[PDB]
Design a binder for this molecule. Structure first.
Ligand code: NHW
Ligand code: X25
Ligand code: CL
Ligand code: MG
Length: 385
């Protein structure tokens, strides 16, 4: 299309394509002293609001906004429905800034109608480790769309990030925008076939009768890696070394400190599940997935799709296929209806064998103020929320 906001930003033009040797900002030698100290102007009747995500009621306001107004399927039957506890987890990572949790209220009602957030993350792109902001949960009320409010929320968080002497960010979206560094399709592994069939997530065809679809997806309730267990605090140094060593092979990944591993992976019910295999006091395999329900739009029988999303999975004692089979099984044991995954890291390699179906669209990865060659999603080693 035209990208009249994006073309004023430091991001590639749609036709830009860079050599592998290119790996730099679009704009360097930036100065915290020069950054605007004034808040970006909102339309008359709207005000900035600083959300405190540790405050139950502020967190609840953001929860309601996203519940009613966040990402939907381009057929409009499902809306992402992140839990309040998930938001807490997602937004209170180590060294997070309260002031990168930005809301917009309509003054006359005092209601939150807009939101955008960022957490700090060390990101390695093509073997350069950069302090970045990981931006997410950009949301404008459905009553207020196409009013050019998103660029205000965007310019306003950029300014707040820049005040911290950070000049780059990472972000993902399903819409195509100038310009992805990688593009990863999503795949779904049915667990509760019948429910999926009933709510129109999956389909039957004459050869695949209901009972055949159910038999197709059925799994044995026995782990390939028998000692896979919920991670605990004692496990963090071992996960740090396992995952950390594994991630170094990729073109794009997060460099986690121990404190970050503890946050990202220590299990929280209905938010984040990590399983580990400990052999001789070493952590040799891990599995992790997060909970992201979709509200079912207008179904007289089901209100919620329980979905597990593949997070970080490493094996040194089994095949990757065996590990991901256990991951599916662990997700089944925790009452999930489906197991989603992106064609990132080694995932694509197992989708056919493990009966994944191809989804409808893809997820684009983006960098802000960074210039580099684009790459296929198997070289992507980071999963955003
Ligand atoms: C160094 C620091 C850097 C910090 C910042 C880095 C950058 C971070 C960037 C943000 C990353 C967030 C990642 C994220 O949270 C994960 S992706 C999910 C985003 N949220 C949703 O989709 C919720 C449902 N939709 C909405 O709330 C609205 O449709 C939104 C608010 C998306 C757009 O509201 P709207 O009412 O429909 O639209 P206008 O206000 O009229 O604005 C139109 C302008 O916004 C551009 N747009 C639309 N969707 C976008 C998107 N998903 N990313 C970036 N840009 C997006 C669009 O191309 C157009 O610019 P253009 O004319 O050039 O085409
Ligand atoms: C986003 C996604 C999908 C997926 N999205 C859709 C369309 C949709 C929209 C709203 C509700 C339900 C469905 N269909 O599938 O599967 C995925 C599998 C893995 C990861 C995905 O994206 C996540 C990381 C980035 N932000 C949100 C979740 C996705
Ligand atoms: Cl401006
Ligand atoms: Mg708008």
């Amino acid at each position: 299309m035209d990208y009249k906001f994006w073309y004023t930003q430091p991001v590639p033009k749609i036709n830009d394509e860079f050599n592998e040797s290119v790996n730099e900002p679009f704009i360097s030698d930036n100065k915290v002293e020069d950054v605007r100290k004034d808040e970006y102007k909102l339309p008359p009747g709207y005000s900035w609001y600083v959300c405190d995500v540790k405050d139950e009621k502020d967190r609840s306001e953001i929860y309601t906004l996203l519940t009613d107004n966040y990402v939907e399927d381009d057929d409009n039957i499902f809306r992402f429905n992140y839990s309040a506890e998930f938001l807490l987890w997602a937004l209170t990572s180590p060294n997070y800034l309260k002031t990168w949790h930005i809301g917009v209220k309509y003054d006359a009602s005092n209601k939150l109608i807009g939101f955008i957030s960022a957490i700090p993350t060390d990101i390695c792109i093509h073997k350069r480790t950069i302090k970045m902001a990981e931006v997410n949960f950009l949301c404008v009320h459905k009553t207020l769309r196409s009013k050019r409010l998103a660029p205000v929320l965007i310019k306003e968080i950029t300014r707040r990030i820049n005040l911290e002497n950070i000049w780059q960010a990472i972000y993902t979206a399903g819409v195509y925008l100038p310009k992805p560094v990688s593009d990863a399709r999503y795949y779904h592994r049915s667990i509760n076939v019948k429910k999926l069939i009933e709510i129109g997530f999956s389909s039957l065809n004459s050869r695949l009768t209901m009972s055949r679809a159910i038999k197709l997806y059925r799994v044995e309730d026995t782990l390939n890696i028998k000692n896979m267990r919920l991670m605990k605090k004692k496990d963090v140094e071992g996960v740090h070394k396992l995952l950390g060593s594994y991630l170094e092979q990729f073109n794009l990944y997060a460099v986690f400190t121990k404190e970050e591993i503890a946050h990202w992976f220590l299990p929280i019910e209905n938010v984040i599940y990590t399983y580990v295999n400990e052999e001789n006091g070493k952590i040799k395999d891990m599995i992790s997935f997060y909970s992201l329900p979709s509200q079912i739009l207008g179904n007289d029988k089901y209100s919620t799709l329980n979905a597990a999303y593949s997070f970080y999975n490493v094996t040194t004692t089994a095949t990757f296929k065996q590990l991901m089979q256990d991951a599916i099984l662990l997700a089944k044991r925790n009452n999930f209806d489906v197991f989603n995954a992106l064609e990132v890291m080694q995932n694509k390699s197992v989708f056919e064998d493990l009966k994944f179906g191809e989804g409808d669209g893809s997820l684009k990865y983006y960098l802000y103020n960074w210039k580099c060659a684009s790459f296929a999603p198997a070289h992507v080693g980071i999963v955003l929320l």
